[PDB]
Amino acid sequence: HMGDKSENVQDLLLLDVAPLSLGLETAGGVMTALIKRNSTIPTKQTQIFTTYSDNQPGVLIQVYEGERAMTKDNNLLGRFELSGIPPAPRGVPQIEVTFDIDANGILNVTATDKSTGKANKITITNDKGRLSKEEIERMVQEAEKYKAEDEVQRERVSAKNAYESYAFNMKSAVEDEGLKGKISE
Numbered sequence: 001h002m003g004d005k006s007e008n009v010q011d012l013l014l015l016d017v018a019p020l021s022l023g024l025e026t027a028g029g030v031m032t033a034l035i036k037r038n039s040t041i042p043t044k045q046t047q048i049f050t051t052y053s054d055n056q057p058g059v060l061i062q063v064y065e066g067e068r069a070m071t072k073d074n075n076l077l078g079r080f081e082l083s084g085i086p087p088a089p090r091g092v093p094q095i096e097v098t099f100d101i102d103a104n105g106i107l108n109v110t111a112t113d114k115s116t117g118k119a120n121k122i123t124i125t126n127d128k129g130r131l132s133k134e135e136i137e138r139m140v141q142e143a144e145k146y147k148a149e150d151e152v153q154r155e156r157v158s159a160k161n162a163y164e165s166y167a168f169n170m171k172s173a174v175e176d177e178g179l180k181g182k183i184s185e
Contacts, residue, residue, distance in 0.1 A: 014105040019136045021067035027051040028157040049095035058082035059111045069150030082120040
């Protein structure tokens with residue numbers, strides 16, 4: 001035992017360098033990349049995403065490739081979510097995502113619920129060589145170049161804690177209550 005009865009011995013070559021970055025978005029709608037371009041192996045990334053309210057039936061993972069602050073200018077790879085528990089606003093705002101990169105070029109992303117031991121794994125692969133260098137060449141430059149546009153969304157994110165600095169005058173307006181007695185038994 002512990003010696004593999006079924007060992008997978010196969011020949012293959014990878015791209016060496018990761019095309020683009022990979023990650024999810026957190027509170028404020030800002031992307032946070034775990035794995036970055038030009039970094040494939042050996043490395044393993046894991047991050048806990050926490051937003052205001054996820055209200056998910058477990059954990060949600062939107063697998064998009066690229067790098068930006070805006071999630072709109074990236075390229076979707078796929079989607080998978082773990083639905084095992086009733087969608088709750090509180091209790092499940094922690095998206096636990098761990099990317100286990102296999103030396104064979106297999107992206108094994110493991111997601112786990114915080115309420116119960118519900119784990120979900122999916123094999124993300126880019127095995128099919130069909131990614132022209134022009135794709136990554138333009139994106140590596142444009143995504144960075146358009147970070148100037150990312151600054152505009154970062155603005156409203158920074159405005160969150162800035163608005164938090166706004167102190168209100170009163171707590172609540174005291175409404176006029178009517179206290180009289182009309183004898184009508």
